[PDB]
Symmetry: none
């Protein structure tokens, strides 16, 4: 894997269809606490205790307490230089008829806030809700999402469970529904949206340059996508903190690389 | 990027927990047809066209014809010298207090024919069915899987679609179900069973030595497994059609696992 910026910039100049696969490193550079490894903890629990349809069935109040916490910490965050370079490149290239798409594992909408428009959110968004009754997906940025969760969601073990009755958790506001809302987030056991994967696969089939940013291509989810682009002879440029590999924060490398 | 067999054996002789990741190259050496790449076609299509939820929903007869073909060709296939050496290595190290486990996305079951017991078939089996109604998972080696597939599944293009009505495709035989069966195999766009991957990770986290044999860069998720073993500092030896050993796995593996 080459570290030549000049050699990368030569493909970048000529690339008509760029696919940027964006991992958690991009979000972390904005102060988003990465909910994986040593960080994958809230009170007594891990992600596999919280982010599952079975968890939501047994204790939706606890799952909503956690996602309220997640929403609260996320909504105070701002796009970083990497997010900005990525958006500015899409805007700039688009005026020339050249394409940039972002595939993100992240659910904080920081790419959207930076100005990214060709955005594929494979894990959904925690600022979207899904109704478990009618199936309607809705935007929700409200703080707090419901009055019962006001002041709730503290991460300390020993914090009392809110034990909010289901009726008082976030409810659908479609006329005549009133169903229980869940976060519009892909949980363990649940498949990624087939329509999204369809769009993703089309982009990978047509791209002439691929970027992996804030993650590596040997790890989920970039490991799903980058190998088949590379096997086609399309250059894959990797930007992370340890064909092309560029070391350092994406906020440092991407502004220059995507200039 | 070592190519020394002498250095591998030193690690092999003492190794307690051996994971063997077995890719499509191991199957190809037994003549099992592959369905990626230029030589990977059934009629007009490759696996990426047929092994999908969408394809099954749109033409279950064509998808079933494809897997029926693959089920039927296995009758002339045998495990190769690679499968045997892997299976003999397992039983041998067993009576020494040592672990050999095989993790594979191969669905042709030649590893278990060869005598492998610690086998993780993480992509299911050609010889297993799943009911799309009741979810029951059943072993199925019946030839043909249903009478409507008798003589069907021809691999050359221009072969007329069987166009078997869904009612005459493989049907669940659980009392009062009658649901449509699919092959119990992981498709493009589908995740692994949650427990399956949790078990893979357990083997990967505890192994002293990893073998990766006949595995392409695009096989998924299996291509992630050796990378995370190496990240631990644990030696990974590549056997293609840290160590690299070139040639048929039936030629290199007997001497490597001797
Ligand atoms: Zn509703
Ligand atoms: Zn059934």
């Amino acid at each position: 894997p080459s570290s030549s910026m000049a050699d990368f910039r030569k493909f970048f100049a000529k690339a008509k269809h760029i696919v940027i696969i964006s991992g958690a490193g991009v979000s972390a550079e904005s102060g988003v606490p990465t909910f994986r490894g040593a960080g994958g903890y809230w009170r007594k629990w891990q992600a596999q205790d919280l982010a599952t349809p079975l968890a939501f069935a047994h204790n939706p109040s606890r799952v909503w307490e956690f996602y309220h916490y997640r929403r609260e910490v996320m909504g105070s965050k701002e796009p970083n230089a990497g997010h900005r370079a990525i958006a500015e490149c899409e805007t700039r290239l688009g005026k020339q008829g050249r394409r940039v798409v972002v595939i993100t594992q992240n659910i904080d909408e920081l790419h959207r806030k930076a100005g990214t428009k060709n955005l594929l959110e494979i894990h959904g968004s925690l600022f979207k809700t899904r109704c478990t009754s009618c199936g309607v997906v809705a935007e929700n940025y409200k703080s707090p999402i419901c009055p019962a969760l006001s002041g709730k969601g503290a991460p300390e073990p020993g914090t009392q469970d809110a034990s909010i009755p289901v009726e008082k958790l976030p409810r659908c506001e479609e006329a005549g529904c009133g169903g229980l809302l869940r976060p519009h987030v892909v949980w363990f056991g649940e498949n990624l949206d087939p329509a999204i994967l369809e769009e993703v696969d089309r982009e990978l089939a047509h791209c002439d340059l691929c970027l992996v940013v804030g993650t590596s291509s040997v790890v989920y989810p970039a490991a799903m996508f980058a190998p088949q682009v590379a096997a086609r002879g399309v250059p894959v440029a990797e930007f992370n903190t340890e064909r092309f590999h560029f070391q350092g924060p994406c906020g440092t490398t991407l502004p220059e690389a995507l200039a």
